[PDB]
Swiss-Prot record, chains A, B, C, D, E, F, G, H, I, J, K, L, M, N:
Localization (cell): Cytoplasm
Biological role stated in the UniProt entry: Molecular chaperone capable of stabilizing a range of proteins. Seems to fulfill an ATP-independent, HSP70-like function in archaeal de novo protein folding.
Family to which the UniProt record says this protein belongs: Belongs to the prefoldin subunit alpha family.
The protein, known as: Prefoldin subunit alpha 2
Residues of the full protein shown: 8 to 128 of 147
Length: 121, 121, 121, 121, 121, 121, 121, 121, 121, 121, 121, 121, 121, 121
């Protein structure tokens, strides 16, 4: 009664939090998009500091503007074209947008169930 | 009464999760610590594939085996000696362990408050 | 008596840790499932780096887009349809979600028992 | 009184569990060691079923008898000779053994402090 | 009916987002806490890169270890003791914790109103 | 439819908010642009109050009017000539304006879709 | 027809811009609210720098913890109790919130008009 | 054909609004500058009401007729001579006048492009 | 011919400036609206500082909470009911909104005539 | 050739408009001067209608013959002697007239530049 | 030679001043227009204060919403219908706008003569 | 030499024009004074048209022979005794005559400065 | 005496290792439990790879959806129902939980004896 | 002195336990391999009593008399000939026996070190 509606509210909140995390992930992917574009603007041999995880940054030059390895998923690095792999990243972004739309549909379904429980008089 | 002990248990679990995140951060710092040491095992000029943030990796070489930049806090860069700044990271880890002990004392305090509300009977 | 209350606390803590491990397992299975999907985005013959457990990665090529072996559990293997295996993974994920709901019910039951012990005055 | 001694006991327990995790990690490294050796026993082109992380497996042929990527640490995979980098893994194992000896010395120091507190009477 | 409950749910979501923003602000204050502590660990004269807003960083040294200017609110260049002003920052954090408790009470009030509207049958 | 038109309105408002955040970022970059130019107006050895991130400020001196570090993207430090990297920031702003024009074209596309749905009589 | 839809678009956009301006105004009022509270945290006699509009800040001691002048509106001032006038600020904030609710009602009315025009077929 | 014409018109309008905002900023600088000079006409220790952001005003006194803070930019307030900061603000005003001349040249270039479209016949 | 189109552009700019002045007048009327509201919130007898137009303010109290004089226009005074005359102020604001719509129509007419002169060739 | 002459004419016209605005401001100051004079001719308690900004007027009694507040500039207030601050307003008028004479000298120098452009034949 | 230049300057100045006076006249006629329209919104019998030249106002009511005096040239009025004569006043405003455009053409001719005298050399 | 003489001439002519405008204002107040006398000659309900600014005139009737409002200055009105305020405006005219005599003294002083320049031989 | 303390510590560590082994046994029972459950989900006839104990696997098909053989140990089993033997496994798991609680009691007893030996002063 | 000798003895005991674990592994391989031989003695279609880890056994017909899946190491599978994988496991056993002989050499070398410590008299 009250309990199922509160459960639906907690479900909607978890969906909202996962949508926010997903959008932060998409924004991180677009940051990596801009980063790879910025690398392609830069030329070879230029002194570059790159992080070591934490706030230490070690120094490198540039030598690898041809095309870049990337994970297919979770474990991988295969040297694909940065254009092609970057398009694949955008395809992943579009998949996550579709997933976000499915989650929004789930939010609408939960609100519809709460509406039905209200309409049960 | 019920509410006070409920808030006590909620604070205990919140501090527990914060201690877990703290120790995960400590383990991350120690992974970066060993990563810097493994950088010191290598030599200059060696071709190394390193990530771009997200899961693509680009190619670097070594030229910075003397001293590495790091933040004072949150914003900063400071080219300090890897030994002294490394020990400074270790000291930060020690201070986080001290703060963890303080939080464990606070959990003992909340349990003592629960014991006091018991002893009111 | 009060050590039994602390035992209830430790039970709720261990159930919360089980919730965290279970949710991490579910998220790991979803990451591996999206990894399988990302494999299905690729085609045969394409060179792919894959790890050996530890951080050495050997190079493979794809010839396994037909249908994929998977365990029943802990010892097993059986070649099934990747869509059917997708369904099987999603089903076991939903089973673990239901199990997590049962765990949260047990946590609420333990809190209700603590509240009854408070109400024993 | 009882407090610092019990704290020393808890420290000894945590160090014992960390030594166990360390040796389990070393055993995992040796499993990967023997796995890479058994890969070197095989020749190129051999049809081999390999996992996807989680419990599904995919099929590959062999093309990795020259040199394998390996981490500096936590983010990295640098293409090195399997021989020298594998000996470097063994050297890191020896470093972990040295650290294990230091931890066992620390445990002996903790019991020495306990028995000093005994001898204070 | 459906409308007032939907409005209450939108209110609870806006409160949740504002609590998340407030807690991110508190975390930023604790980052500033750690930053000031890290500054006080540093000594005068040592070269330091500080950001310029955007990702450029310009170079300085330390001469500000006596006591630090801060804002009273929104406008102010008030020079206070870094200890005393840092205690004032912690006092602000405690005020925001109290404010978060008031907001959580408001969330419980909105849930109680939804419960009442359900109980009107 | 009605739902498609409301989805169009939501997408147009999301693009409008993206345009607002984008132009705010552009204005922030131009503020940092003028800030770097104002640093170039000053001389070396000059005592200046500089922030600590949050609202406290510390005291700097000037020694580094030659050329300033900057990120390539998202993680980087790279000491480039302030004029050349400054023009690079300007070109990034130009690309953001181009992307803004693309988003304006997309708003015109959604408006044309609304026009088509009207034209379906 | 198309014109009426475009006019509804421009109206909903202008109302959304009014919502944004009103929310920025309310946020500015709450910043001034916390600023007044922060002034009440201090004491008389303390040396304080305060701005002159632009970035110049001149120095003062405190003598305004008794009761403060505040505008009636647009041209006015009158010395009132900081508590009661602070409450009055909160009351005008709530009136603007009610006004914003009326604005969102008008937006929903405009979308209802859009849906009516679609249902005219 | 006429899209670029309306784009020219919109750019001229945006530059006109930019000139308006810029001259309003310059006039604001002059108002605060004359306010500072009016403070310099006054002597120390004089009781003065000054605002809190919002239109409440707190009471101050004068002791700061020696040298006043000023920004490098966007984050800064460095205590400099009011005469030299005066002249610096005047120089920045002259820079904004030069930029205004450049914008008016750009408007003339847009009408020259209109003349080009005329001459295409 | 081309002079006429340039004159049309100057007319559109003068109309835009008149729209800006008109909206400033409307905002002035809304500030006077809120000021009269704030007057009606205050009671009789309370000492209130009101300006002399320019820089100085003089002191008054409230005794006019019944019905308020206002001009018909430019010369007039007529004591009418503050709510009814305030509604009349809102009515004149609506008249200015209608006039603003007429001006927007005229700008569309001028751009249409420009594009017709284009379409002549 | 023609352009600098036309720009000088435009600058002379803009300075002439500034002269007109300045003298209108000075005349407004003298109107406020005579207004405060006529207030000082009156006595306390006198029933007086005074405006609300816009054309409506509200009723006041007089209690402000002691001495009158005055702003420093754009934000400020301070109670000064009405005679002394009124003399200060007169001094500000003298400053504005001095600045007007400086502008007239500048216009004469602009025509001298025009005469130089003539004399370059 | 230079006398023609000074004559052109004084003519452009006097024409600019008469343009400003004519625009003030047009704005005055529009204010009286809005005043008469506001009288038309009022009804007969309503008590109305009207000025006596100087800023005393005397009281009347409305009886004259049917016909109003007007004069054609420069001397003496006579009474016709209010709204047709109001249209006649608006047409006189349009003819003054035409005359103003003739004066603007004359100013352009004066600068053309300036350019001709420059082009003589 | 003759420069300051011509400046004296310009000053004297500006003061003469201001004396002329002052005497025009005096005659204006006297004609309004005689208009008030004409109001006192008439009786109630009499209908003679009144100027409404422009050539348009509306019809009054008389009900305001008790005592009449009058401005204090620039924004004001207040119902005073028409005879008392009549004498007061007359005394303001007398003070304007006094200031006119002061200006005539200043012109005599300027001619005395001219005589000093004669006497500098 | 202190040998006995070290013996107590070794006993506590052996009990902890036994708890770890027993909990690993329980987790093994749960993994094989859910494995047999997922075997019960699968149907007959499906080709299934199953191990030989050690490294290699052999291929089977399902015909065992009736019920399950089991023994206490090692000589002569008996086929009982899979749900009934499932409950039997769960009962033995509960027995191991009880035994684990007994071991935890024994660890508390050993620490209590250590604390008593400390308390023998 | 004798302590490092006792440490050598503990090392020899750990090596002896490793020898025992290694021989247990080799015996396990031989037992599973003889179980594979017993499988090869059977034929297809025969129901087979197979241990399934825990005390549950299932039944199976044979279809796996062609070539057998087997891991490379820890993760892998490879359908190879049972004679070929037989010889493969045999050669791995030979490698383990070789490593055992190396460990026996290490034990003899440690005893030789202890003999050297005897010889240091």
């Amino acid at each position: 009664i009250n309990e199922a509606v509160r459960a639906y509210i907690a479900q909607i909140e978890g969906l909202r939090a996962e949508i926010g995390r997903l959008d932060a992930t998409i924004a991180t992917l677009r940051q990596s998009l801009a980063t790879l574009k910025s690398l392609k603007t830069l030329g070879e041999g230029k002194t570059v500091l790159v992080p070591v995880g934490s706030i230490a940054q070690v120094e490198m030059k540039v030598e690898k503007m041809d095309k870049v390895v990337v994970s297919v998923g979770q474990n991988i690095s295969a040297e694909l074209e940065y254009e092609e792999a970057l398009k694949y990243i955008e395809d992943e972004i579009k998949k996550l947008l579709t997933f976000r739309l499915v989650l929004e549909q789930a939010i609408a379904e939960l609100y519809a169930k709460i509406e039905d429980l209200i309409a049960e008089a």
